[PDB]
Design a protein around this ligand. Structure first.
Ligand code: NA
Length: 187
């Protein structure tokens, strides 16, 4: 099984809108749980922050809190589907650059920054250019993803396109960990 063991600050950003729905959001959670389980999460290795967004953005787990796999996974289990009426992807991205990845919020100065963002709908809001240092790998799930929007957000990273949320926990973890370890997408 593909492994990722390195000094890395990883963010998971999950769309939890009404358009996603509780059932598909739970599949996104299960995808995320599987990835964290496979990752070498620890104080001296991979660190994890988790965000959920729709109408607003919730920091479900900051970098500043205990970086053990057990503490992260248990908070993840506690995460509740918000079900908002918007897909404010631009706001979620602003959180990453202006809050999540700050040293004052637990991020490591020497660690590279990597974001896996699971979304199934076009952004409701304006998306602004992220600082190049924050690498975003968009995971566009389902027929309603705005692929060109995700390509622009992602560059240099190709979006990972998944047919549906049922396939997400089955297919995506392998691809996510390959990207984690190598630093680049496939082919
Ligand atoms: Na960082």
């Amino acid at each position: 099984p593909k492994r990722c063991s390195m000094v890395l600050d990883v963010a998971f950003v999950l769309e939890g809108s009404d358009k996603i729905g509780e059932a598909d959001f739970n599949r996104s959670k299960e995808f995320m749980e599987e990835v964290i389980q496979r990752m070498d999460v620890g104080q001296d290795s991979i660190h994890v922050t988790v965000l959920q967004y729709s109408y607003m953005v919730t920091v479900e787990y900051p970098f500043s809190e205990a970086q053990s796999k057990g503490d992260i996974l248990q908070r993840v289990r506690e995460i509740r589907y918000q079900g908002g009426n918007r897909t404010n992807t631009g706001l979620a991205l602003r959180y990453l650059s202006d809050h999540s990845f700050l040293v004052s919020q637990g991020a490591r100065e020497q660690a590279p920054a990597l974001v896996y963002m699971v979304t199934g709908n076009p952004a409701s809001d304006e998306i602004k250019r992220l600082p190049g240092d924050i690498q975003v790998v968009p995971i566009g799930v389902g027929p309603n993803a705005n692929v060109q929007e995700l390509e622009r957000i992602g560059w240099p990273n190709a979006p990972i396109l998944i047919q549906d949320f049922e396939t997400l926990p089955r297919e995506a973890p392998d691809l996510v960990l390959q990207r984690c370890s190598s630093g680049e997408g496939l082919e």
